[PDB]
Amino acid sequence: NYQPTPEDRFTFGLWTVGWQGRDPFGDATRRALDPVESVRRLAELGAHGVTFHDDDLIPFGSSDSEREEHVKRFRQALDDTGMKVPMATTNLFTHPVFKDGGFTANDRDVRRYALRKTIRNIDLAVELGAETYVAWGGREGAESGGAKDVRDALDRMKEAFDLLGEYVTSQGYDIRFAIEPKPNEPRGDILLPTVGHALAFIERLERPELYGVNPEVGHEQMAGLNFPHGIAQALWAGKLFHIDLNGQNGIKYDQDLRFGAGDLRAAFWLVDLLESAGYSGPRHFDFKPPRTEDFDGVWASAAGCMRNYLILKERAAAFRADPEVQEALRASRLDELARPTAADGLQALLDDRSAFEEFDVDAAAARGMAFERLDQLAMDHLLGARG
Amino acid sequence: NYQPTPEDRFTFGLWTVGWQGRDPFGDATRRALDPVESVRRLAELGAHGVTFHDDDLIPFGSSDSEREEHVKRFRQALDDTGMKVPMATTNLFTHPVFKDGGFTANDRDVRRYALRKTIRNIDLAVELGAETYVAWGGREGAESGGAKDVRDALDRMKEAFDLLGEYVTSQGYDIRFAIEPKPNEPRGDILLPTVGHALAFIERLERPELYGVNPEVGHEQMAGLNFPHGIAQALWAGKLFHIDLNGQNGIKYDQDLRFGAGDLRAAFWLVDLLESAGYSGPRHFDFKPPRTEDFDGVWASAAGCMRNYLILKERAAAFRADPEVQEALRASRLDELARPTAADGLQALLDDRSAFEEFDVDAAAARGMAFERLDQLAMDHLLGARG
Amino acid sequence: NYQPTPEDRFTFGLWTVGWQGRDPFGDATRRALDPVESVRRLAELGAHGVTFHDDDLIPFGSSDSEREEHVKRFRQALDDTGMKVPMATTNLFTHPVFKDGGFTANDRDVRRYALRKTIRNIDLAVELGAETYVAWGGREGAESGGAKDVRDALDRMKEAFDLLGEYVTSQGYDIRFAIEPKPNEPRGDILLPTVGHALAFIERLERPELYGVNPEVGHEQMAGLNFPHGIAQALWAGKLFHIDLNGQNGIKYDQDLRFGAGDLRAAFWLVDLLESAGYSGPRHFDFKPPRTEDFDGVWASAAGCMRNYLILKERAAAFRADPEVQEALRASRLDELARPTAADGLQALLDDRSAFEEFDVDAAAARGMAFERLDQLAMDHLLGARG
Amino acid sequence: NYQPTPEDRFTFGLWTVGWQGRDPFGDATRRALDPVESVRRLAELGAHGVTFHDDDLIPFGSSDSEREEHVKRFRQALDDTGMKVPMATTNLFTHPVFKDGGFTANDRDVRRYALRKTIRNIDLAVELGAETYVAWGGREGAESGGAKDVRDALDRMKEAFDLLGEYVTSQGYDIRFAIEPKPNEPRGDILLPTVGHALAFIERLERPELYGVNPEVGHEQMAGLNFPHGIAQALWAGKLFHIDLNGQNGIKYDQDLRFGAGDLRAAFWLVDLLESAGYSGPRHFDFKPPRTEDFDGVWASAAGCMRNYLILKERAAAFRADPEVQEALRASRLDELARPTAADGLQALLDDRSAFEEFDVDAAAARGMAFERLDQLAMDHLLGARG
Ligand SMILES: OC[C@H]1O[C@H](O)[C@H](O)[C@@H](O)[C@@H]1O
Ligand SMILES: OC[C@H]1O[C@H](O)[C@H](O)[C@@H](O)[C@@H]1O
Ligand SMILES: OC[C@H]1O[C@H](O)[C@H](O)[C@@H](O)[C@@H]1O
Ligand SMILES: OC[C@H]1O[C@H](O)[C@H](O)[C@@H](O)[C@@H]1O
Ligand SMILES: [Mg+2]
Ligand SMILES: [Mg+2]
C-alpha cells in the first residue's frame, strides 16, 4: 500500500540521507555515504531523482582532475540507474571563509570568490539536467546590530543575483533561480527571513522573471507562520518554483524531521493546496534522519517521507470529492469568496444604497460561518473516520 | 531634560491613550476619554498630532447630523490647539459584521460594505489634512485551514486596494496608503503577516506607487523577526510611509507596551537606522497604557514614549559621532560592504584569477571580523558608560 | 459512530459554550446563554457534567436573595437532567478590582477580599458535589520588572493557599485543589507559568497532599513545551488531579480551540498516555467556539471535542495492541528503560569492569535506536492506514 | 572604568573561550586552546576561576598515564596563577554512545557507563576544590513520542541522582549538585525543560538537600519565560546553587551570546535581584564568542561579559538608592506586598465585614497602580539619564 513510483516526482538531497549526524553538541554517529550508493538506494525506494551542493559531490579543494573523477562516477550511476537531477545548489556556508556570508560578506574579496564558486556549479548543474538552481543564504546576516548595514547588504545581494542572471542569459541556459528563506540559524538573524521578504526582494531584481522561491516547511514554522498560507501567496504570485518538504515541532532550532512529522494538520492542508493547485514541480525532501538511527533507520525515514505524502494526498482527494464537504463549503460561502466584490465598478458601488445606506448590518452580523462543522469534516477525512 | 516639542513629529492614536483597559479576560478599568480632551492633553505634552479610526471619532451608527457634530467639535480643538492629523484609518474589526473580515469576508455583501465604510472615511481624512491612510486587516484570515481559500482571498484583497486607488486618483486626493502587517490575533493567522509579505503583495497592485507599509515594532517581534532589519528592507524598497512605535516582550499576545519597553537594544538600533537614513515621517506611537493605571498613569506612559525616543536618539548620535566607533567600523570592514562586488563586470570577474584560481582561502578565513568589540562600544554608548 | 455517553466522563465549563465571542478587538457575536439551557443541551450531547466560576452562575454583586434564585434554578436543571458538577473555580480576574491580582495584589485589602470571595464559592461547590476546586491565577504577575517583588508575591501566594487548606480541613470538606498554570496573558508574565513551576510551588505548602495541577494543553504549548511530557511528570509525582483539553497552534495568544485542533500528534500521544496510565478524572474541555460561529456551530464544536477524543482513543488502543508495534518497542529497547540501572547497588556498580573499564563504547555507539520505524507505525495507526 | 577583580567572583568554562566555532552548518574557525593558556589569560582579565567538563581537560579515551599528565599541567597553572575551580561537570552528550541519553538512555549498559564516567569526575572535581557539580542532561529526551516512556525515564533519572547522592555522602565529600535545565536542542524536547520542572523533580529525590538548580539566562528564554521571575522562585525555595549568565535574542536556537547582549532589560532586573538578595555564588559565564571572531575577539567578548555585569550592578544600586524611586515604590504599594494578608488568622478574616460584606469594591478598583512611572524611573537609571 501507498507505494511510491518515479511518477510521484519525489526527490532527495545527497546531504539528507547522507547526513552523518554531527550536531552543535555531538560528533558524527554514521559513516559517510558514497553518492553513488545513495543514488542506487534511492532508485530502489522509488525516488524520481536527487539534488546536491557542489561540496556534497566534489570534496572542497579538489583538483580539476579529481573533480572530473567524482563527476564521472556520479554520472554513470545516474545513467545506469536513470535517476534525474532536477535541482542543484552551492555550499556557501560550511567553509570558514564564509563565516560572515558569501554574497553579503563585508570583505569584498570573499564576495567575488562566492560568485565564482556559484558560477562554476551552475555550469555543472545545467550539464546534468537541473531545471532549478537554489540559493540558501545561510550565512547572510548578523548576531549584532552594528555588524551589518542592511541596506548596503541588500544592494550587494541584488548585485550578486543580477550578475548570476546576466551569466545564465549570456550562456543561453534554461535554468531558473529559487531563493530559499530561513529566519535564523546559523546566524542570529538571516537576511530575507521569510517567503514574503524573498518575494518582495525578487521584484527589485533586473530580470525578476528568472527568480522564484524554494520555501521549506520547517523554516516558515520557525517564525510561527502558516506554511500553507505562505505557499498560497507564492502560487498567487507565480513564484513557486520548487519546494522543500519536512517537519518541524514549533519555534526552535531547525529540526528537518521527516515529512509528516511535526505539524500534521499543516501537512494535510499543504498537500491539499499543492494537488488542487496543480503544482507540477519536484516534491523534494530536505530532511535529516535523526542521529539516533543506523543506516536501516536512514532508509526507513526516507521511505516514510514519501509514504506520508501519498497517504495525505489520498485523504485530501477524498475530502474534496465528498458531496457532504461540497455542501459544507457552500454553507460557509467559500463559493462567494471567488466572486468579484465589485465587478460592476467603482461608480456603481458608490451609488448602490444596498451596500451602505440600506445595508442591514445586524442581519449580516447574525449569520454563522459554519466553519467548525467544515473543519470537523476535514478532521474526519484526515483520520479516516469517513471516506 | 529630553523635552519633546512639535518639531519631533511625535503622534498618537485616539485609541491609545483612550484605551479603557478591556482585555479578553477583564472589564474596562478607565472611563472613556473625550477626543477633544485627548487633543488638548497631548498638545500640552509636546505632541505633534493625533490619528484616528472612523469609529474612535464618530460612534458607529451615528446619523449624518450626529456625525457632523462630532467632527465640528474635533476640528475646533484642532484649530484652537493646532495639532495635526497626519494619518487616519478605518475600523474594520470591532463590529460583529466583520467577524470573518472586511475586504476578504466570504460574504460578498460584507466586502462591499467594508469598501463603502472605508471610502467615507478617506473623504474625512483628506479634509483634516492626513497624508497617509493606514489599513490593518486584523480580521482578514482564519482559524482553520478550510475556511479561507487564500488565493481567492488575495484576489479579493487586491480588488479592494485597487478600487481604493482608483477612488483616490479619480478624486485628485494627495494621500497614500500604508498596509500594517500583523501575523496573528485576533485571527489564528492573519493574511499578509509580515512586512515582507505586505511588500510583496503591493507589487501586484495596479498602481504600486500609491502603497507602502506601516510596520509596527511589536507585530514583527510576534513572529520573532528582527524589526530594524525589516525596516531596512522597507527603506531599501522606498516603501516606509509611516511607522508604529511601541514595545513587546517576545512571542506572545500583542502587548503594545510604551516605546522603549520590551526589546531595548532593538529600539536603539531602530532609532539609529531611522535617524541615519533621514526618515522624515511621523513617529507614531501605537501603544496601550496598561490597565493597571489610572489617568495620571496614562499621561505618564505617553510622556515616556517620547522621552525614550529622545534619549535613544541622543545615544545613537553619540555612538556614530565617536571616532573610536568610526575606527571600529573600519576594522569590521563596514566600509567595504558599501563597495560594489564587481563593478568591473561579469567578464572581468570571470577572468580574474585572484577571485578563484589564486584566491588564498585560508588567509581570508583567518581574518577576524572584530564584531564583538564594535558591539561592546555600542553597549557602552547605549548605557552612557562613554560619550 | 464514536458516540459519547456519560461513562466517557466528558465535562464542559459554562464559560466555554457560553462564550459570547468578545475578544480584545471585537464586540460579542452571540447572545448570553442561560446556564439552565447549557446543562440541558450538554446532557443531550452525551456530556457527563459541567463546571463553573462563581460569576458564571451568580451575577457579580447579586444580593443573597438573588443568589439563591440562581442556584435553585441551576440545581433543578441538574436534578432533572442529573448532570454532575465535578469541578468549580473562582473568577478572580474579570472585575477591575483584580487588575493587579487577587492573592498577590499589592493592595492588602484586595487580597483579603479575594480570599473571602473564594471561600464563599468553595462552600457552594461542595454542596453541588465538586471533587476538585481549580485556581487559575490569571492576574497574578506583572508587565514590568519593578512592579512585583516576586519572592514576596510567592509568600502571599503560599499564605493564601495555606489559608484555603486550613479552611477546607476545618470544615471537613472532601475537596482538593488544582492549580492551573499559564505563562502569560492577560499579564505580561504570570506567576507559576508552567506545570513544573506549579508542582515545585506545591511542595512548599503546609499540606501538600491537598494540592495538584490542572494543566491545559494550550497553555504549556504557549511556552513551546511538550504537553504529554509535562503530563507524564505530573502523573509521576501523583499530582494530576484534573485536566483541561483543547487545541493551540503554537506560540501566540491563548486560542482555546476545540480538542483535536492544533497539534494533532500531541493530542494522540496525550490520549495514549492518559488511557495507558489509567487516568480516571474528568476529561474537561476548556475551549471557545470561534466567534465566527452561530449557536449551531457552538454545539457542533462541542460535539467535535468529544468525537476527537474518542477517535484518538481508538487509534492509540490499536497502536498499543498491534504485535508489530510491540516488536518495534522491543527493537527500540523501551523494555530495557523500565529495568533498574543498578539494582545491584552502588558498590557492585563501582566494581563492575564491564560498566567502564571493559565497556565497548564503540559497539554500543553503533547500535541504531530504530526510532523512525516505530514513529512511522504510530503515524500509520493515527491515520488509519493499518489497524 | 568598571574593572573586574577576583572579588567579583566572575568565572568561565574552559569550553566557552575555547569554543572553536563549529556549528551545525560549519567547520571550526579557530584553533583549539590549551587549557593552561586559558587559565593564564582569564587570570590576567580579572577572572576569579574556571570550570570544566571532564572531556575539556582530559581527551576522551586517555590512558590513566595520559590523564595524570593533563591534570598535573592544569594544577600547576592553577597553583602559579591561583585561579579557583568552583564548579565542574560531566560531558554526557558529545560521544556517539550518548546519542539517546546518559542517565535515561534506553540501553541499560549505557546508563551504567554514564554513571561510572560521572563518578570518576566527581573525585577529580573535589580534589581541585569544586563546591558545585553541575548536570546538564542535554541528550535526555526524544524527537518522537513513542521513543521514550517518560515516567520510566524519570524513574531512571531519579535512580541516577540518588546513586550520585549516595556516592558523595559515603565518601564524605562537601559538594552539592545543580541541575541545569534546557527545553530543547540537541533533542527535540529535553526532560526537565525549565527551572520549575527541575525544582519539582528535586523534591522527589531521596536527599533533596544535596540538589539545587543551575539556571541559564538563555535557556529559560528559549521557552519565552521571564528569567528574573524564575530565579526569584529558585531563591524563594533555597535552591539557587549556581547560575549561568549569557544572552539570547528570543525563542530560537541556543545562542550563548555574551552577558548583556540579548534581552538587556531582563539582564538589569536579574542583576538587581541577585545583588539585592545577596546571592554569594559564582557569576559564571556560559557563552560562546561568535565564530566570526579571531582570538582578539574571544578575549574582548569575555571582558565584555564582566564589564556589562559591573555596569548593570552600578545602575541597579543607583536605582534602589534613589529617594524618588523609594517614593515611587511606596506609591505602587510594594511595601504592602510584604505585609501578611491575614496574620490575624482564618477566623478573624471570616468575621471581618470590611473584607467582603462592607468592602468598597469600586473605590479599590479606581486606585491606579502607578506602575508606568516606576518603570520609567527604572529606564532612566538603566540609561544613565539620572543618578
Ligand atoms: O541548498 C539549499 C539547502 O542548503 C542547506 O543544506 C540548507 O540547510 C537547506 O535548507 C537548503 O535546502
Ligand atoms: O488603524 C490601524 C490600527 O488599528 C488597530 O487599532 C490595530 O490594533 C493597530 O495595530 C493599528 O495601528
Ligand atoms: O477556572 C479556571 C479557568 O478560568 C479561566 O476561564 C481560564 O481562562 C481557564 O484557563 C481556566 O481553566
Ligand atoms: O556542564 C554544563 C554545561 O554543559 C554544556 O556545555 C551546556 O551547553 C551548557 O549549557 C552547560 O552549562
Ligand atoms: Mg531546515
Ligand atoms: Mg531547505
Ligand SMILES: [Mg+2]
Ligand atoms: Mg500591536
Ligand SMILES: [Mg+2]
Ligand atoms: Mg499598529
Ligand SMILES: [Mg+2]
Ligand atoms: Mg486557555
Ligand SMILES: [Mg+2]
Ligand atoms: Mg483552562
Ligand SMILES: [Mg+2]
Ligand atoms: Mg546555552
Ligand SMILES: [Mg+2]
Ligand atoms: Mg549552561
